[PDB]
Amino acid sequence: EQSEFDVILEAAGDKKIGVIKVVREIVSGLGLKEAKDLVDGAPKPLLEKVAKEAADEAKAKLEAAGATVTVK
């Protein structure tokens, strides 16, 4: 089985401000401007080479906020 995963933010959806907040909660140390630029630049990677549980939690939190995500 695959041992590490990337999380791609594909689209922010209708509630971009909320998605910026969720991205900042998920990604430790991500600054405010960096998070805004990541969301405005989607599709963009959010997490790279992380554990499956961390990827699944990130996807669930972002999707609940209206975003579209791919775990790879």
UniProtKB/Swiss-Prot annotation:
The keyword Ribosomal protein applies. The chain holds residues 59 to 130 of 130 of the full protein. It comes from the Bacteria. This is Large ribosomal subunit protein bL12. GO terms for cellular component: cytosol; cytosolic large ribosomal subunit; peptidoglycan-based cell wall; plasma membrane. Belongs to the bacterial ribosomal protein bL12 family. The keyword Transferase does not apply. Forms part of the ribosomal stalk which helps the ribosome interact with GTP-bound translation factors. Is thus essential for accurate translation. Signal peptide: none annotated. Homodimer. Part of the ribosomal stalk of the 50S ribosomal subunit. Forms a multimeric L10(L12)X complex, where L10 forms an elongated spine to which 2 to 4 L12 dimers bind in a sequential fashion. Binds GTP-bound translation factors. One of its GO terms (biological process) is translation. GO terms for molecular function: mRNA binding; structural constituent of ribosome. It comes from Mycobacterium tuberculosis (strain ATCC 25618 / H37Rv). Was identified as a high-confidence drug target. Keywords: Ribonucleoprotein, Ribosomal protein.
